[PDB]
A paper describes a structure:
In the present study, we perform a detailed biochemical characterization of the BAI1/ELMO2 interaction, and find that an evolutionarily conserved fragment located in the intracellular region of BAI1 specifically binds to the RBD-ARR-ELMO (RAE) tandem of ELMO2. The RBD, ARR and ELMO domains of ELMO2 bind tightly and form a structural and functional supramodule, creating a highly conserved elongated concave groove capable of specifically binding to the BAI1 fragment. Each member consists of the Ras-binding domain (RBD), the armadillo repeats domain (ARR), the engulfment and motility (ELMO) domain, the pleckstrin homology (PH) domain and the C-terminal proline rich region (PRR).
To delineate how then the BAI1-EBD is recognized by this ELMO2-RAE supramodule, we solved the crystal structure of ELMO2-RAE in complex with a synthetic BAI1-EBD peptide at 1.7-Å resolution using the molecular replacement method. Each asymmetric unit contains one BAI1/ELMO2 complex with 1:1 stoichiometry, consistent with our biochemical data. There is no significant conformational change in the RAE tandem of ELMO2 upon binding to BAI1-EBD. Except the N-terminal 4 residues and the C-terminal 7 residues, the electron densities of the rest of the BAI1-EBD (i.e., aa 1471-1495) are clearly defined in the complex. The BAI1-EBD peptide, composed of two short α-helices, occupies the elongated concave groove formed by the ARR and ELMO domains. The complex assembly is mainly mediated by two parts of interactions: (1) the C-terminus of BAI1-EBD forms extensive polar interactions with ELMO2-RAE. The hydrophobic core is formed by Tyr1475, Leu1478, Phe1480, Ile1483, Met1484 from BAI1-EBD and Leu202, Leu244, Val288, Leu292, Pro427 from ELMO2-RAE. Particularly, S1473BAI1, R1474BAI1, E248ELMO2, R251ELMO2, E298ELMO2 form a hydrogen bond network. Notably, the binding site of BAI1 on ELMO2 is far away from the RhoG-binding site, suggesting that RhoG and BAI1 would not compete with each other when binding to ELMO2-RAE.
Residue numbers in the entry:
A (entry chain A): 5 to 327, 338 to 515
B (entry chain C): 1471 to 1495
The structure:
């Protein structure tokens, strides 16, 4: 009643065509097949798919066999695992190489892997890496197969990553930290370190000590996109696993060794088009990078802290002192003409989280790094006692909040996204630079709308539309982003809105 | 303080398994 038509093949023989009763034990089928070819000891054999990854057939997966499938009679997984336990440890180096090749093939099959793992097969591989001689020089091909088999076995999730010795860890890290070796070995070594880091806080700690920022970044400079992808993956893994209180230091260390420009020049603008898995790693890197802003975003100012109040005083001084009766008039209004809602105690405005102290950081950056722009914006609006001034303090806080929303500061990385904004790979302080560009935009839009204070939320909405219609054009640089914004003036936003209506 | 990343399925988010499969053909 429940039948599947298959052909079963064996080297040197003609196929047997069977109508397999799915109620019959596989052992009965295999004995039939063996008898057909005069093979003794049917219990030594099993069936596997002839095509694809050639998986072993079990009483489970036999249900998936489609009519007309070609199967092969093969050595059973248990006997194959025992044979490879012997041969991967042969003193005959050709025997060992051949065995490791076969082990790398079979280890992807969980039916085989469980047999091999249950004889401490993984320890055969780790002991070889720990103590084998001339592995990189004389036996690099064998070593690549060894590492392939190791990673395939570990990927079945049967045993904990914490089983690995400090000696094995150090050897794998050694392959990464060395003036680059074989590409196959480096690829697998990076892959193993990534998996170790992701799966164990203990392994993360040991690995973080064994590899330098410089060594990791150097691997981004190879022309091989898979090496580059695993290098960024390992970097991402270290960031993901780093304690909250160490992640910022790590970012500064990578930044000082030019991680960003190396990615820009060797990946983003590289000869080889970026394929999906590299794109995904660039997405994760950008998510982790924006999340470095999250703590400050959620930090409230302490309005009773004189040092923090003094930062706002400094901000005001930089602008107001660039302006004498006029200057006096500004200061008599406390912080009103710097545009804070809380005129007398602007520190209170920085207790809103988001954006909290991040907004203060952005303002101080603009004032220290782009003083002329800062002064222009404040002074065009600090003597304005018609209701048309653009309030700097209030605007900057709301803009910082808006940028955090747009760029999704605080969002976790997930499996489904591969998107990133390439212009953030073009400047060490791209977030702060973006703030400066967007506060100039906000002031331009404000003036284009002849806005008053009552219009504040409407202007912010236009500015939000401007920014978010510019980003999907994927500007290559901050300058390109600026050019794009110029093509989205208030009058253009009006036209686009009308076209929707 | 705890890590904001402590609770996620790191291999799944990182596509670790898929990348191995790509590498091992």
């Amino acid at each position: 009643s429940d039948i599947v038509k298959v052909a079963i093949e064996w080297p040197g023989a003609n196929a047997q065509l069977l109508e397999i009763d799915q109620k019959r034990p596989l052992a009965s089928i295999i004995k039939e097949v063996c008898d057909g070819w005069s093979l003794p000891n049917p219990e030594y054999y099993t069936l596997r798919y002839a095509d694809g990854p050639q998986l072993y057939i079990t009483e489970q997966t036999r249900s998936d066999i489609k009519n007309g499938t070609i199967l092969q009679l093969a050595i059973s997984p248990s006997r194959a695992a025992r044979q490879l336990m012997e041969r991967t440890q042969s003193s005959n180096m050709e025997t060992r190489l051949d065995a490791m090749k076969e082990l790398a093939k079979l280890s992807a099959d969980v039916t085989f892997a469980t047999e091999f793992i249950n004889m401490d097969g993984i320890i055969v591989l780790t002991r070889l890496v720990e103590s084998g001689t001339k592995l990189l020089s004389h036996y690099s091909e064998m070593l690549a197969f060894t590492l392939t088999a190791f990673l395939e076995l570990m990927d079945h999730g049967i045993v904990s990553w914490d089983m690995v010795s400090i000696t094995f860890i150090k050897q794998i890290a050694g392959y990464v930290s060395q003036p680059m070796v074989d590409v196959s070995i480096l690829q697998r070594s990076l892959a193993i370190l990534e998996s170790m880091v992701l799966n164990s806080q203990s392994l993360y700690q040991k690995i973080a000590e064994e590899i330098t920022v410089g060594q990791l970044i150097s691997h981004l400079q190879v022309s091989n996109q898979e090496i580059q992808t695993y290098a960024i993956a390992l970097i991402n893994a270290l960031f993901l696993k780093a304690p909250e209180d160490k992640r910022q230091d790590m970012a500064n260390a990578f930044a000082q060794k030019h991680l960003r420009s190396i990615i820009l020049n060797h990946v983003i603008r590289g000869n080889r088009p970026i394929k999906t898995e590299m794109a995904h790693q660039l997405y994760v890197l950008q998510v982790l990078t924006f999340n470095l802003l999250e703590e400050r975003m959620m930090t409230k100012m302490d309005p009773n802290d004189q040092a923090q109040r003094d930062i706002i005083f400094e901000l005001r001084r930089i602008a107001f002192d660039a302006e004498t009766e006029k200057r006096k008039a500004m200061y008599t209004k406390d912080y009103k003409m710097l545009g804070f809602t809380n005129h007398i105690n602007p520190a209170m405005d920085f207790t809103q989280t988001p954006p909290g102290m991040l907004a203060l950081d952005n303002m101080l950056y603009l004032a220290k790094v782009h003083q002329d722009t800062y002064i222009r914006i404040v002074l065009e609006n600090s003597s304005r006692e018609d209701k048309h001034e653009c309030p700097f303090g209030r605007s900057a806080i709301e803009l910082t909040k808006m940028l955090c929303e747009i760029l999704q500061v605080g969002e976790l990385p997930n499996e489904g996204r591969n998107d990133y904004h390439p212009m953030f790979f073009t400047h060490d302080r791209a977030f702060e630079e973006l703030f400066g560009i967007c506060i100039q935009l906000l002031n331009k839009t404000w003036k284009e709308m002849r806005a008053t204070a009552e219009d504040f939320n409407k202007v912010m909405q236009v500015v939000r539309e401007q920014i978010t219609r510019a980003l999907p054009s994927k500007p290559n640089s901050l300058d390109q982003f600026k050019s794009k914004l110029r093509s989205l003036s208030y009058s253009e936003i009006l036209r686009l809105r009308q076209s929707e209506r | 303080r705890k890590s904001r990343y402590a609770e996620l399925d790191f291999e799944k988010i990182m596509h670790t398994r898929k990348r191995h499969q790509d590498m091992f053909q």
